[PDB]
Structure formats: C-alpha cells, structure tokens
Design an enzyme around this catalytic site. Structure first.
Site, mmCIF file in Angstrom:
data_model
loop_
_atom_site.group_PDB
_atom_site.id
_atom_site.type_symbol
_atom_site.label_atom_id
_atom_site.label_comp_id
_atom_site.label_asym_id
_atom_site.label_seq_id
_atom_site.Cartn_x
_atom_site.Cartn_y
_atom_site.Cartn_z
ATOM 1 N N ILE A 62 32.617 56.317 -25.952
ATOM 2 C CA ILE A 62 32.222 55.449 -24.790
ATOM 3 C C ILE A 62 31.607 53.954 -25.305
ATOM 4 O O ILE A 62 32.236 53.106 -24.806
ATOM 5 C CB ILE A 62 31.301 55.753 -23.868
ATOM 6 C CG1 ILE A 62 31.104 55.039 -22.337
ATOM 7 C CG2 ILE A 62 29.784 56.118 -24.428
ATOM 8 C CD1 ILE A 62 32.560 55.176 -21.636
ATOM 9 N N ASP A 63 30.786 53.725 -26.068
ATOM 10 C CA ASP A 63 30.464 52.504 -26.701
ATOM 11 C C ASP A 63 29.777 52.821 -28.123
ATOM 12 O O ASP A 63 29.818 53.536 -28.425
ATOM 13 C CB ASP A 63 29.137 51.853 -25.658
ATOM 14 C CG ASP A 63 27.919 52.427 -25.731
ATOM 15 O OD1 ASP A 63 27.655 53.552 -26.119
ATOM 16 O OD2 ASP A 63 27.152 51.914 -25.077
#
EC number: 3.2.2.27
Lengths: 215, 215
Positions: B70-71
């Site tokens: 996701i990040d």
C-alpha cells in the site's frame, strides 16, 4: 417469493424484480436504464427484454465465485448467462468438457452454471442485437460497471472468460481464454482448477463444479 | 543512461527521471504532482522527496509480475518498495521466509524484490508522513491510480499485499495477506506459489523467486 422487491422502469421490460442483495444499486440502475432503453429496444435482442434482468433474482450473499462472459449468446439467450436448455451452444459445452476432464464425470447430457452453490454466472453486458456480439456495449456501459462492482463486493474470485473480449476495491480476478478458443484445452482446464485453490487461500470452501451437470 | 528521460516539477524533488516505458503517463503525473506537492512536503516523509519517484527508472516491458504494498515503510524507505538495506523490516523478512520455505534455500542474510527478473515491487502510495502508514493517501490518490493502471498494462499478474489495506482492463489480480499478519503462514506461502501457476496459465515464464536472495 417473500424475500424480493421490484422497481418500475419507463421502457420494456417495464418492471424489474430483484433479490434484497441488489437493493443498494437498484435506483442507480433505474436512472441509467431509462436514459438508454429507447435505443436498446429498437433492435431484436438476445435475450428478450423480459429476460434482461432475471439474474437479479439471484442472491449474492451466498456466492463466492463469479463466472463472467462479456455478453449473452448472439442468439437464444434465456436471461441466465451461459444457459443453453438443449445443450447446443459451444461455450457451455466446452465448459462442461473441462469440468468433465477435471472431475472425471464421463456421461452427461447438459451443464448449467446457474445451479452450483457459490457460483453466479454473469454476462457483463445484459443484451446484444440479435446475431451480433458486443453490439450493445455502448448502451450497457454504466450499468455493466455498476452491477459488476456490486458483484465483486460479495464474491471472492472473479473469473472472466475471453482476453480480448474483456478489453474500485481489487478482488482476486482471473482472466482466462474464451470458452470456444481453439487449441487451448490445457489452459482452459487448468484455469478452472485454480479457482478452488484461490478460494482455499482466501479461507473459502471449494466450489463443487460437478453440481452443474444435468443427467 | 541513454534510454531515459526527465520532467520538471514545480516542487521537490523538482526533477523526475524515468524510463521510456513510463512516458505515456508522465505529463499527467506532472500535472497531478504540482497540484498536491505543497501539501505533501509540509511533513518529513518516508522516503525523502529525492526518492519518491526512483522506481520510475525501472523498465516495464520486461515485467510480468507486480508485487504491490500500500505505501512505503513508516520509516527508512529507500524509494525502492520493500527494500531494507540492513534486512531489518518485518515485511521483507516475512517475504524472504516464505520464499525460503517455498524454494528450500536455507541460509541468507537479506532479500530484495527489486532484483528478480520479471518482478516490479511497488508501493501504491509513493510516500507517507514519517511514522504514519496511509497518512498520505489523499495526496497520492490520482497519481496512485494512474501509475498502477499503467503497470497492469504490462504485467500479467498483480499481487497486492494486505486485504484491509487495499480497501480499467481486468488483469489477473491476487489480494493476499499483509506480509506481517499473524498465524497465516500457509496462506502467505501458498499465495506466492500460485503466481507461477497463473503465469503458466497465461503462457508466461515462471518467476525465479530465489533471485531475490542476498548472500
């Protein structure tokens, strides 16, 4: 039955009855369909307008796999995707063969995806001009998006059939060959087999593909 | 090198250099980033602004799997997704363990997804406020969509890591557990194993996951 609702649309089929599970998307569906239906109806269609929306009678909460083709058979659509009452359409025949080769079930006289627990068979576009595949793509556009997006909120695996045919929250998706694609028997067979493995990964019960057989 | 280009943005890092394969999306990326960068930069970030876009140096045409988180790590991001120079972050350690259990490679001192042929490791959002996961989601939004959509035009399998984390043309997508999720070792292991099978189905060469090991 006593678990369903209906909405009124301005054009044929004039009334859509649907399972409670589809409720969230129904008023958006009514809007979109009144905008486009005048243009859809100018043509003879597969299936007939009375059978466009019959799959909305199907519940979603008990489903974990969606087997999805692009649109109904060029002719003889019943409103149930992949359904071929007299077992004549190549698509469902080839699907049946794969499940035969996968399961070992030798003798059968038909096959229907609509009768397998945890499977919803689906047409992305809900109609086509009689004799022409993808000929109604423009009309179905926004409805096709809405309904599939809703489906993927319930099912754990989406299986789409036809690579070049199929040109918000990610779900497990497989894009395999068109059921009637030539000399791709292994890939077609194996594609089905993988679904149950993916379901195991997602801690879901396997699909009993043999339930689709008609004797 | 002699196969790359660059564009000018109005805020830090001021210049993004990129591989020709990313060209189609670069002017849309410049627009979006000038709109949001003032707000991104107010915070200390992982990684530093100079390393936001370094993965655009990676070619896409030779890739067939995208492994996507996701990040970046809450701290110590290098600009290469999943990269942990001193092999300290739980995510890459757990990934390495799975590949160990899958391949049988016992002894290693590190693991990096960025050095495996046909694999692009990827962060959906390209930054986070130092110490806070998903804290930059709003800023990255439109860029995150643009870049992933471009990736899926090249790779045959998208593997996203983290179910609740991850809340146009369909590609084969798997959503598996977060690498650091507790008591889901089988599902994590098996998830990786399936990728190569799916690639076989799509008539692609397997990934050699052992290439990621550092000795």
């Amino acid at each position: 039955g006593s678990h369903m609702n209906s909405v009124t649309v301005s054009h044929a089929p004039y009334t859509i009855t649907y399972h409670n599970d589809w409720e969230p998307v129904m008023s958006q569906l009514v809007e979109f369909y009144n905008e486009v239906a005048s243009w859809l109806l100018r043509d003879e269609t597969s299936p007939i307008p009375d059978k466009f929306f019959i799959q909305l009678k199907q519940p979603l909460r008990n489903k974990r796999v969606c087997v999805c083709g692009i649109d109904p058979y060029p002719k003889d659509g019943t409103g149930v995707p992949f359904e071929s009452p007299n077992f004549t359409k190549k698509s469902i025949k080839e699907i049946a063969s794969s499940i035969s080769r996968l399961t070992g079930v030798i003798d059968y006289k038909g096959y229907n995806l609509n009768i397998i627990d945890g499977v919803i068979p689906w047409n992305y576009y809900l109609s086509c001009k009689l004799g022409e595949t993808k000929s109604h793509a423009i009309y179905w556009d926004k409805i096709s998006k809405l309904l599939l997006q809703h489906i993927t909120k319930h099912v754990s695996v989406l299986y789409c059939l036809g690579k070049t045919d199929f040109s918000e929250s990610p779900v497990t998706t497989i894009v395999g060959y068109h059921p009637a694609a030539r000399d791709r028997q292994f890939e077609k067979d194996r594609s089905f087999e993988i679904i149950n493995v993916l379901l195991e990964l997602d801690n879901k019960a396997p699909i009993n593909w043999a339930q689709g057989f008609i004797y």
